[PDB]
Design a protein around this ligand. Structure first.
Ligand SMILES: CNc1nccc2ccccc12
Lengths: 39, 156
């Protein structure tokens, strides 16, 4: 039995930690909703 | 139960202790999460019950109490924020410039940020605070790193 608990508001935070890269990837999406890499 | 707009953890008592299996967004009275978090099961909110209303395994999305309400889209240029809600940890905003998933049916934005599986369903936001998609369905690239699609539904 699953339940939900509030965790916060949805708002843009000014001066948040900025991280992560921006890769451009060729992918495929199967009928089961799974993404895979296409080479 | 609690119907206030916002971000929520999705918990279960089935396994050892209380375990966070995902996250979701309550907006306009509807709860939105990824299909792989709930597998379409009903949810509890305090004393109330939320029943699935719409879902699709291929999009990997599900809405409860009503139709999918989130319609904002990544503009393809701007930085966005993942409002990550990790298990046992406080909600935190992380700003990033999305990459791209290129498919035979078009391109989708993607965020290269690595969080535990129980963070699936955490919303990705634009500068106006609008939810442009949910985090948690993606791929593991060459170096073992995780890249999630910016998954968005359709508002009928
Ligand atoms: C292979 N699966 C995963 N690995 C790492 C982080 C993840 C975050 C959300 C959903 C799945 C994830």
């Amino acid at each position: 039995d699953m339940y939900i608990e509030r965790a916060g508001d949805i708002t843009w935070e000014k001066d948040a930690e900025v991280t992560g890269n921006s890769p451009r990837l060729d992918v495929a999406l199967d009928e089961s909703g799974d993404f895979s890499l296409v080479e | 139960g609690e119907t206030t707009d916002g971000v929520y953890r999705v918990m279960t008592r089935r396994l050892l202790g209380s375990t966070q299996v995902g996250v979701g967004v309550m907006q306009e009275g509807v709860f939105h999460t990824m299909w792989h978090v709930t597998k379409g099961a009903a949810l509890r909110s305090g004393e109330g019950r939320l029943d699935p209303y719409w879902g699709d395994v291929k999009q990997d999305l599900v809405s409860y109490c009503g139709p999918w309400k989130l319609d904002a889209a990544w503009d393809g240029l701007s930085e966005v924020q993942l409002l990550a809600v990790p298990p046992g940890e406080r909600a935190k905003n992380i700003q990033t410039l999305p990459g791209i998933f290129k498919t035979k049916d078009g391109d989708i934005g993607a965020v290269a940020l690595d969080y535990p599986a129980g963070t699936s369903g955490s919303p990705i936001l634009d500068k106006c605070g609008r939810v442009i998609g949910l985090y948690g369905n993606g791929v593991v690239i060459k170096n073992g790193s995780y890249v999630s699609a910016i998954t968005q539904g359709k508002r009928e």
